[PDB]
Design a protein around this ligand. Structure first.
Ligand SMILES: Cc1cc2nc3c(=O)[nH]c(=O)nc-3n(C[C@H](O)[C@H](O)[C@H](O)COP(=O)(O)OP(=O)(O)OC[C@H]3O[C@@H](n4cnc5c(N)ncnc54)[C@H](O)[C@@H]3O)c2cc1C
Ligand SMILES: Cc1cc2nc3c(=O)[nH]c(=O)nc-3n(C[C@H](O)[C@H](O)[C@H](O)COP(=O)(O)OP(=O)(O)OC[C@H]3O[C@@H](n4cnc5c(N)ncnc54)[C@H](O)[C@@H]3O)c2cc1C
Lengths: 496, 502
């Protein structure tokens, strides 16, 4: 039947089909479980046709990102704007204090810088079976350096640096301090429609290759040198090769009993031991998103980066100043319910960088699942997030946010910000994502997963996806790369 | 010919710490020979207007996460409430002559593109060797060419100027400075020594004061083949030592591998310095971080920040050139074409009023300016004229007015919010024969590791070396010198403990 069958039509599978096509391979299929292409790339339409990337949103590592360069070379030719560089001076807001960023007395970014360097030291060339929760690492720093920090620095620095949760979508007690501090190949570029990247790659191979709304339920290497793919609807396929691009979290279901779990793939012979073992040394984070769409911007556009700090206390300073050592420090902090001030929140002020009166808010586990479980209660959401939204507005030279999500406009706003809609992501609940992207807990190492994935179940069952490659690991451009990788190798093999 | 266990040449912080450690262990009959009438070497605190003191040599403790000297200081301050240092890392205020402030600018965002420029550099150099060095200037050109699609015009105009404050971490213009060694990461914040002479005297008074013998310049070090070191002061005194520890600045030691015996400071080695050692002098060179102190009557300006960098003049034509070049070679060439002014290079200014109370700026400067400015350090009114534009511009950006030359007090009452320059102090290191520059940075192609190896392994088992130029951790830095003196002395201590029964 089919020369190559690609499972999943995310950026991996799409690039893999595109490469297959580019090398002259025909009779390939792309089988996608969702009713759209793009996977964790998803541009959503909200109020008055504004568009948002509820999935991946930036090109990272833009000095070296081979996908981004590709995009830049297009913009160099047709002049149009595919991305904007929106790195900015973060505006940091504590509920009580207001703006703590760029402070003459607080100097929070400076000691943040010291803690990052402290972290790079505490790990690189020493090992010692280190690794601890990003939280544990920050406590260590606070112990070693308390003599050289003010009380406010001890209060507010540990909250400010929790902006790092939104890089992985994990709370700092779940984040590997090791993974917390990784370099970045340069500025970030906010994609002005990642769906246009998807569109570009998807229309670059025959559309009759793409079969939509077709979950795959099993894959079997009849040792007679072909691969049986069995879709859920019952259609079965005879494939020379298979490129499986299902998310890491999805593939993980393959190595547990009970196969009803939607998205799982039954492997016969099952995933070989060097594959199953890697799931122990790498996990999945829950970065989530919330879009607040306002009628029009009536707040300062000083910056597109605004992070609200979780509440901090005078007695956290005291406990720090008292502990003899880290065990005493960890133990003393034994001292509820969740609000919007209970964790850091990352707000992209789109009005400055794309001219659209909306905020793009990032959130993390454990908050992400809870907020995603109530994504349709738009009134709950307005209640939960109203406090930080007003603190933002007030620090941004505006006023409290009016709930204008159902009709009846009073006409007297003009300088009051009016919320018209909220969009929420769903990746934790969507059975075909089951989290955000690869992310490690303390004591993980992607290296095992990469190796296992990159070299295949056998020569016929291959793997692509953001979890399957070292450079750009967890990023859309790694996924992309991993695609071109598998397809290039198969292209050379078919091309006889 | 008196016999000494160890003889230390130079009473800089390598010498003093070495003497401190030797005494700490219990070694007796040691000697610190120093050519100057004072100890401290390139650490020296001077006094100016109304007794205000300034460290005209080293001012900061660097790498305070690890700097063992700093931790020693901080352990003492922890133990007695005394203020020995103050953390004075601030958010830089950047000043361009035309534009005024361009720091932390919502449109310009130079700090962020500076940061990417850093990563660009670091990506250019990694793993190892093969990489081939270049000038720091030329790298910034490379970054601009490679990245002009993603830089605004004002970014291309101003980023090159803003980043050159690295000249002031090295004392070297960006065309003299090695791209490789430029972004040498800093292990934490810095602490401004509140008197570095408190360090000097504390270490100086931790060994027998009769060991100290200032104003003796060492002019020859002769290793008798019969396992004894002869030392020759210029006053004719001759000494016999089991071990010597040379701590003269690399710039001074370099003269030993030239002829002309009469150069001030030069030591005559016999045997000559190891061919391993002579060679390392080609793979490292010397920096000229200078300093100038501007003392004003009182502080009548904004104390937003203790850190102010004035930008060398730039042009929009430069941007044009950057957009319209085809490659690095042709970019370099288009760049071709004034007389030097205060606006001809970055200048780093420390507003001590905020960090210490004292109404005085501590401005740092770099080769080639330093030597020219240091060579007119006595012509004060020439100094004032030369720095008056950047001084005035700074006061404009700090909510004050132009500076009144009040060096020759003729007085005025109607000065309450006008700044009055009372005194200008200038360093002198490039012209001091016993320093001959600041501390040694890297030229294009220099590998500082050669020196550290040739120094740290000694001329032989008895002629040893310490100093800022003789150690990896803290190279060029007072704690590098400090740790190096502990090194040679700790090793000598152990050897003499086992030396033939005691
Ligand atoms: C909130 C969020 C923000 C992010 N932001 C960024 C960012 O700014 N920059 C960045 O570089 N990356 C970002 N990422 C990560 C990026 O989205 C992913 O790395 C990328 O999409 C990887 O895609 P993939 O091709 O490996 O798999 P995907 O695109 O996730 O999925 C492969 C496809 O397989 C399909 N599939 C699953 N199970 C089955 C089955 N049983 N049968 C058939 N098909 C199946 C899925 O439906 C999916 O379409 C973000 C991720 C999240 C969640
Ligand atoms: C302007 C400036 C600013 C600086 N700022 C900092 C800073 O902020 N932080 C930092 O960590 N470092 C700083 N440094 C560097 C620091 O000052 C040096 O690393 C250090 O002080 C040098 O110590 P040393 O003991 O190796 O040499 P020195 O202190 O130079 O000691 C060498 C001694 O040898 C003597 N001598 C030379 N020839 C002979 C001879 N023939 N006979 C006898 N004696 C001789 C000299 O008189 C001198 O006393 C700065 C340097 C300069 C110039």
């Amino acid at each position: 039947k089919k020369k190559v069958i690609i499972i999943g039509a995310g950026i991996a599978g799409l690039k893999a089909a595109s490469t297959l096509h580019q090398n002259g391979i025909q009779d390939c299929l792309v089988l996608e479980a969702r009713d759209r292409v793009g996977g964790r790339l998803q541009t959503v339409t909200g109020y008055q046709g504004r568009k948002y990337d509820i999935g991946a949103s930036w090109h990272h590592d833009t000095l070296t990102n081979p996908l981004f360069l590709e995009e830049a070379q297009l913009s160099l030719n047709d002049g149009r704007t595919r991305f904007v560089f929106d790195d900015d001076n973060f505006i940091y807001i504590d509920e009580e204090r207001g703006r703590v960023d760029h402070d003459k007395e607080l100097l929070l970014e400076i000691v943040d810088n010291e803690m990052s360097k402290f972290a790079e030291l505490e790990f690189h060339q020493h090992l010692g079976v280190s690794d601890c929760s990003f939280f544990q690492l920050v406590m260590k720093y606070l112990l070693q350096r308390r003599q050289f920090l003010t009380n406010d620095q001890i209060r507010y620095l540990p909250q400010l640096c929790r902006y790092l949760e939104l890089w992985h979508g994990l709370d700092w007690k779940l984040l590997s301090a090791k993974d917390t501090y990784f370099g970045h190949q340069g500025r970030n570029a906010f994609a002005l429609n990642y769906d246009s990247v998807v569109q570009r790659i998807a229309q670059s191979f025959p559309q009759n290759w793409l079969k939509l709304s077709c979950e795959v339920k099993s894959i079997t290497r009849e040792p007679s040198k072909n691969v049986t793919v069995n879709c859920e609807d019952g259609t079965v396929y005879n494939a020379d090769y298979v490129i499986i691009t299902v998310p890491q979290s999805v593939l993980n279901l393959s190595v547990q009993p009970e196969k009803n779990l939607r998205g799982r793939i039954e492997f016969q012979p099952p995933l070989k031991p060097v594959i199953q073992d890697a799931f122990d040394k790498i996990h999945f984070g829950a970065l989530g998103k919330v879009i607040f769409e306002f009628e029009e911007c009536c707040w300062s556009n000083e910056s597109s980066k605004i992070v609200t700090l979780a509440n901090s206390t005078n007695e956290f300073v005291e406990i720090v100043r008292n502990a003899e050592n880290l065990d005493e420090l960890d133990s003393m902090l034994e001292r509820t319910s969740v609000t919007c001030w209970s964790q850091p929140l990352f707000f992209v002020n789109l009005s400055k960088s794309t001219g659209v009166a909306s905020f793009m808010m990032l959130m993390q586990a454990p908050l992400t699942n809870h907020i995603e479980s109530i994504r349709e209660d738009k009134e709950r959401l307005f209640s939960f997030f109203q406090p930080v939204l007003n603190k933002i507005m007030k620090c941004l030279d505006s006023e409290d946010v009016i709930d204008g999500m159902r009709p009846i406009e009073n006409i007297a706003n003009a300088n009051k910000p009016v919320l018209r809609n909220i969009i929420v992501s769903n990746w934790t609940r969507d059975p075909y994502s089951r989290g955000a992207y690869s992310a490690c807990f303390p004591g993980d190492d992607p290296v095992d997963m990469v190796v296992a994935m990159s070299n295949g179940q056998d020569s016929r069952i291959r793997f692509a996806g953001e979890h399957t490659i070292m450079d750009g690991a967890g990023c859309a451009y790694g996924a992309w790369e991993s695609g071109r990788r598998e397809a290039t190798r198969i292209s050379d093999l078919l091309k006889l």
